Design a protein around this ligand. Structure first.
Ligand SMILES: Nc1nc2c(ncn2[C@@H]2O[C@H](COP(=O)(O)OP(=O)(O)NP(=O)(O)O)[C@@H](O)[C@H]2O)c(=O)[nH]1
Ligand SMILES: Nc1nc2c(ncn2[C@@H]2O[C@H](COP(=O)(O)OP(=O)(O)NP(=O)(O)O)[C@@H](O)[C@H]2O)c(=O)[nH]1
Ligand SMILES: [Mg+2]
Ligand SMILES: [Mg+2]
Lengths: 166, 166
């Protein structure tokens, strides 16, 4: 069956894991638990096609650097996550995307920009800001909340659809 | 506020109305009730942007012909609907798209191909078939069921996102 190798990347603490666990295990992880590296494989049906989602959940931190090249080389699509209440994480998105482009030698790699934690009332990143950045990248922008489950399937299924028509 | 003028088109009986009513009124219309023309306006928030969805629900039938040019000229995005248990409706998709392209003098108009009634076990149109047609058009393919609500928000929000980066 078609397998889609999805990679979730973004700054420490933005909700990479919480989004992934919501998708795979249907619950909000409300606890501090930093990732080193985790993978999740799940059989799903998306728009009638039977497929397997092979998801790598990554660490946002330092050492990784070249350990990042490795998973960026084999990933087919990337969810680029920032948190709407954390401006530095939104600014960090550019470094992740430049790094993906260099390793893939490509200026169009399937990618979705995700503004997570939209359930929080204190936003520091306006939707408009994120929206212009995504359009400058030519990629979709989706806001999500791993807490309410808002936009979670939408964010991952839109990425599969981006891979499908690459 | 940003308004998005969405138009739902497709053959008689494929579920144009049922999809629209699911979105706006949250209930499945399980009755025979042919459309002449209906419009629905609703304020929503999509990916953090406050906007108004102005939706025209159209008739699939004959007279319309030039009455179609009229609403195709002002529509910004089109949901092109067929039913997965009705092959003629899938074949009719091509005439609707050619007609949209001619009136808009454009080969890329925001559009989503929707295979509705995916809750039914007797499909006559394979997902694979629909998927290759959408990719040949360069547009997303989404399967939906107005009965279960599966994919309904996804189909309309993906169309808004297509308009946003046109
Ligand atoms: N309100 C709210 N909290 C969230 C959301 N997503 C994650 N969180 C919280 O934010 C914190 C970090 O979440 P986590 O998923 O571990 O982030 P991460 O990006 O995976 N961290 P790491 O890079 O270390 O691997 C946790 O306390 C988690 O519960 C969200 O959508 N809304
Ligand atoms: N099982 C199932 N039935 C559906 C679905 N969508 C619509 N129907 C049924 O199919 C029939 C036609 O639905 P309707 O929404 O009126 O189709 P239409 O495309 O709007 N017809 P018209 O072109 O005449 O305006 C109705 O009996 C309706 O309940 C669906 O997703 N699943
Ligand atoms: Mg994590
Ligand atoms: Mg109707």
């Amino acid at each position: 069956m078609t397998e889609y190798k999805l990679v979730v990347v973004g700054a420490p603490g933005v909700g990479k894991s919480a989004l992934t666990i919501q998708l795979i295990q249907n619950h909000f992880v409300d606890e501090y638990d930093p990732t080193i590296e985790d993978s999740y494989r799940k059989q799903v049906v998306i728009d009638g096609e039977t497929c397997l989602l092979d998801i790598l959940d990554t660490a946002g931190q330092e050492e990784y650097s070249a350990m990042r090249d490795q998973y960026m080389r084999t990933g087919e699509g990337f969810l680029c996550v920032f948190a709407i209440n954390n401006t530095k994480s939104f600014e960090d998105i550019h470094q992740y995307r430049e790094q993906i482009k260099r390793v893939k030698d490509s200026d169009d790699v399937p990618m979705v920009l995700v503004g997570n934690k939209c359930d929080l009332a204190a936003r520091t990143v306006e939707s408009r800001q994120a929206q212009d950045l995504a359009r400058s990248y030519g990629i979709p922008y989706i806001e999500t909340s791993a807490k309410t489950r808002q936009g979670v399937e939408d964010a991952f299924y839109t990425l599969v659809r981006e891979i499908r028509q690459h």
